[PDB]
Amino acid sequence: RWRQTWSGPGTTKRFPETVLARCVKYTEIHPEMRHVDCQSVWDAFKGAFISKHPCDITEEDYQPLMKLGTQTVPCNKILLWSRIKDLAHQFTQVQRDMFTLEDTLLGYLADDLTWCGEFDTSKINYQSCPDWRKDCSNNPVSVFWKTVSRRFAEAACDVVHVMLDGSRSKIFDKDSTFGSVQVHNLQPEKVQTLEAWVIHGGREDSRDLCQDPTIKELESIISKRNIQFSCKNIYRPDKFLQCVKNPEDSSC
Numbered sequence: 001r002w003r004q005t006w007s008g009p010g011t012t013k014r015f016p017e018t019v020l021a022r023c024v025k026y027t028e029i030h031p032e033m034r035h036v037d038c039q040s041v042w043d044a045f046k047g048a049f050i051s052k053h054p055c056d057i058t059e060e061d062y063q064p065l066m067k068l069g070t071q072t073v074p075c076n077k078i079l080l081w082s083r084i085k086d087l088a089h090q091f092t093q094v095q096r097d098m099f100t101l102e103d104t105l106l107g108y109l110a111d112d113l114t115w116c117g118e119f120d121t122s123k124i125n126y127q128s129c130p131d132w133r134k135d136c137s138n139n140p141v142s143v144f145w146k147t148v149s150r151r152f153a154e155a156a157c158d159v160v161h162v163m164l165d166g167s168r169s170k171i172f173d174k175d176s177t178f179g180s181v182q183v184h185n186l187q188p189e190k191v192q193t194l195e196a197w198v199i200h201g202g203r204e205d206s207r208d209l210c211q212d213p214t215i216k217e218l219e220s221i222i223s224k225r226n227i228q229f230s231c232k233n234i235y236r237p238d239k240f241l242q243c244v245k246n247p248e249d250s251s252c
């Protein structure tokens, strides 16, 4: 107990009860998911990683879960994000203008949780789980997010929006889930434009960050996919959120 197996945090306490409860809550609230059997969902989620080496997980392990979690999302209202999840969520919560991954049954089930199992034992590992960097990238949590994030990108059509954190060293980060998985799985046949909203953290008075080298990079990558690119600065996200809640506002 003075040295754990893995370098990452262990499985969230009460993980099984938490996931099952989340599934119940989501399916009570969202009527199109009203039929989903939540025991079946939990069984499939378990099936992905229980009794498996937590450095040997594949997208295949998650297919029963992905199937049970099949859900239509309005394809033209998708909001992607990188390193700025709270603003993304606060924004969609005002009046459901857009949908993030966390607004789907599967995103909702897993948000903020950690989980892993052990090879040749059916026990959940509450003590530690693999770190993506130090231990392995093919771990239960990372493989889950990669799979669901890919599928979410594949669902998009028309204008897709992305919120980016303009206070970061790399506003667009090629190594992020957004940059390494989602940008490459938008379907050029279906997606007309990717519109980036660069969210300032430099509080008030700041530059045109749509000119940032990494933004030019993003523009290049997506342009070469035959998708148009658009960018906007959000200089004061506090004002932005206020204008979303009350666009009948003078300052707006």
Ligand SMILES: O=c1c2ncn3c2ncn1[C@@H]1O[C@H](COP(=O)(O)OP(=O)(O)OCC2O[C@@H]3[C@H](O)C2O)[C@@H](O)[C@H]1O
Pocket: 079, 080, 081, 082, 083, 084, 085, 100, 101, 102, 107, 111, 112, 141, 145, 149, 152, 176, 177, 178, 179, 182
């Ligand atoms: O929805 C999630 C999500 N919820 C929780 N997490 C998510 N990751 C990716 N996504 C999807 O990818 C991106 C965000 O991932 P990121 O680019 O690595 O940002 P980021 O680096 O802020 O996301 C970090 C992050 O937080 C966990 C996951 O363990 C992970 O990699 C969004 O567009 C989502 O659609």
